[PDB]
Amino acid sequence: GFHSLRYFYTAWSRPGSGEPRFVAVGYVDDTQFVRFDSDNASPRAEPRAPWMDLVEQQDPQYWDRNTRNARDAAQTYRVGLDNVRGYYNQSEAGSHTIQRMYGCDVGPHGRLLRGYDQLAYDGADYIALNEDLRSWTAADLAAQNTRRKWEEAGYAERDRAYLEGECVEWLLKHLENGRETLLRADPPKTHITHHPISDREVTLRCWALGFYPEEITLTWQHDGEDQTQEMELVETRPDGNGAFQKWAALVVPSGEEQRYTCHVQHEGLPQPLTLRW
Amino acid sequence: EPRTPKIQVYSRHPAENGKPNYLNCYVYGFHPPQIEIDLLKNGQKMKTEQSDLSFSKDWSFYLLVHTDFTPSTVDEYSCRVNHSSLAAPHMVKWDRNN
Amino acid sequence: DYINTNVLP
C-alpha cells in the first residue's frame, strides 16, 4: 500500500493582528514530522516527530537547508498575497489567504505513483499543476496572470524534478527512519457504551480508540440491516498522542439493545469486528 | 465564503475521576485561518497548547487544542471558539460520554 | 526537504 509525503503552506493576512503570517507543515501519511512558523523570531524549520531527532546526524545540513527553503517560501507567499489582491483589486483591510499543497505518493515498489502541486486563494482552487507535471490549470482570469508568470519562470519543470526525484527519495528516507511510527497499523480498541435517555429509549455508542492510520469504517446494523442513515457518526479526530478516535451512536428502544451490532473495519484488524451489547 | 468551525471536546482516554487524562478541543472545517480556541475549567480559561495549522483536501483548516487534566465530579469543562465566520463565540461543553 | 524553489503568484 502506498505512502505519501505531503507539505501544507498557509500564508494569511490578519488586519488588526499585525504582519501577515506563514505556517508550513509536513506529513508522512497521517503523521506530522516538521513545522515552520514565521511568527517566531529568527524562525527555523523544526522537528515535530521523534524519529526526526535522528536526521541531524545523517544530514547535518537538513535543518539549515529546510530553514532557508521555508523562509524563502514565507517571503514568496506573503508577497503573493499582495500580488493576488492586486489582480482582483481587493482592499488591504481584508484578510486573505493563500494555501499550497504539494507532495508525492509512492507505491509498494518504491516508485512514484503521482506528484501534485495545488494552490488555493481564499479557500478556493486558484492554480494547480496538471497531472502531466508540465502545465497548469488556472481557475479564472486572475490566476492566468500567475500561470503566465510560472510558464515564463519554467516552474513546472522545477516542480516535476522535485516531485519525481527528491520528494520520493525523502519519503523513502522518512519511512525508514520513522519505521516504528509510520509502518504501524494500530487497530482500534473498541467497546459499546449504553446511555439511557428516557424511559423507553437509550443510546448505544460504538467507540474506536487509539487507531492508526486515520482511515476507518464504523457501521451499525439492525438484524443484519445497515443503519447508516439513522446513526450519528462523528468525524475522525486526533487523540493528541499520534493516533485517532471515532464513534457512531444510535437511538434504540429500551429492551431491544441485543438486536443491534457494531461493525469496525480498520487495516490493523486481522478481520473486521462485530460487537454487541 | 467563510466556513464555520465544527467542534468536538473529548478526553484522550475514557474519563475516570481522579486519574490524570488529556482534554482535547478539536476544531476543523473552518476558513479563514484566524481563530480563537480555548479550553475552560468552570468557565475560566485554562493554559493550553495548540497544534500547528494544517488543512484538509477541501482547503479547510483543522486545529487541536489540548492540556492535561484530572476529571472530577465537580469540575465542568468547555471549549470556547470565536471565528470570523461567527457572530458570537461558540461554547461546547465537555461530556465524558461525548 | 521543503521544495527549495518558490515562485511568486
Numbering used by the authors:
A (entry chain A): 1 to 277
B (entry chain B): 1 to 98
C (entry chain C): 1 to 9
What text appears in the publication on this structure?
Major histocompatibility complex (MHC) class I molecules (MHC I) present antigen peptides to the surface of antigen presenting cells (APCs) to active T cells through interaction with T-cell receptors (TCRs), which play pivotal roles in antiviral defense. In this study, we screened bat MHC I Ptal-N*01:01–binding peptides from different bat-borne viruses (HeV, EBOV, MERS-CoV, and H17N10) and determined the structures of bat MHC class I complexed with these viral peptides. The overall structures of Ptal-N*01:01 display the common characteristics of classical MHC I molecules in other mammals, with the extracellular region of the heavy chain folding into three different domains. The α1 and α2 domains construct a typical PBG that contains two α1-helices and eight β-sheets, and the α3 domain and β2m display typical immunoglobulin (Ig) domains and underpin the peptide binding domain.
To verify the uncommon peptide presentation features of bat MHC I, we determined the crystal structures of Ptal-N*01:01 in complex with the two HeV-derived peptides, HeV1 (DFANTFLP) and HeV2 (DYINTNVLP), two EBOV-derived peptides, EBOV-NP1 (DFQESADSFL) and EBOV-NP2 (DFQESADSFLL), one H17N10-derived peptide, H17N10-NP (DFEKEGYSL), and one MERS-CoV-derived peptide, MERS-CoV-S3 (DFTCSQISP). The structures of Ptal-N*01:01 with the 9-mer peptides HeV2 (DYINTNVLP) and H17N10-NP (DFEKEGYSL) showed that both of the peptides adopt similar overall conformations as the HLA-A*0201–presented 9-mer peptide GL9 (GILGFVFTL) with a Leu at the PΩ site. Although Ptal-N*01:01 can bind peptides with Leu as the PΩ anchor, the binding peptides can also possess Pro at this position. The Ptal-N*01:01–specific Gly80 in Ptal-N*01:01 is small, which provides more space to accommodate the pyrrolidine ring of PΩ-Pro. Indeed, detailed analyses showed that the P2-Tyr of Ptal-N*01:01–binding peptides form hydrogen bonds directly with the main chain of the β-sheet on the floor of the PBG. In this position, the P2-Tyr of the peptides form hydrogen bonds directly with the main chain of the β-sheet on the floor of the PBG of Ptal-N*01:01, which leads to a stable anchoring of the P2-Tyr.
